[PDB]
């Protein structure tokens, strides 16, 4: 399935190069800016446990998700793997505890030492 296609397939896009977030882009956009720090950011998506369990998906707001980059008001792997993607993008993105909600987690939708899975669209970025 799409998280072992990960792992197996995905590239290691931290800068530690500890495979915490590695990713595979599943379309690729038009453009070629990625956006930058302080960008205001449109996106769709859908998450769960690596596991199962638990699911979130934008489409279920009908409408985007939107969040200021590089701010952490997202897990420390959506700055790192929205930063990567260009307009029009839909990446896989698999994460490792320590880029997400570690030991804590995050009751009652995470539990500890979570594992994460992503599909991500990227809409559109503006500038702040
Ligand atoms: C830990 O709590 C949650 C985790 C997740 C979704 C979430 C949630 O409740 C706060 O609720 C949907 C909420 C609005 O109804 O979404 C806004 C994005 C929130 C940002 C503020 C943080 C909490 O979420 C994230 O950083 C990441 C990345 C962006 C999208 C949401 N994501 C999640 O961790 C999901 C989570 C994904 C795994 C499956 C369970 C939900």
Do not use: C
Request: proline content about 5%.
């Amino acid at each position: 399935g799409a998280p072992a296609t990960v792992t197996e397939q995905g590239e290691d896009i931290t800068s530690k190069k500890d495979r915490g977030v590695l990713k595979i882009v599943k379309r690729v956009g038009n453009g070629e800016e990625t956006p930058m720090i302080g960008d205001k950011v449109y996106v769709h998506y859908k998450g769960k446990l690596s596991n199962g369990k638990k699911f979130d998906s934008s489409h279920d707001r009908n409408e985007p998700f939107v969040f200021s980059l590089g701010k952490g008001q997202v897990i420390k792997a959506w700055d790192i793997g929205v930063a990567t993607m260009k307009k029009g993008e839909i990446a896989h993105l698999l994460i490792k505890p320590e880029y997400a909600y570690g030991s804590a987690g995050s009751l009652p939708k995470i539990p500890s030492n979570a594992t994460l899975f992503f599909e991500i669209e990227l809409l559109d970025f503006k500038g702040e």
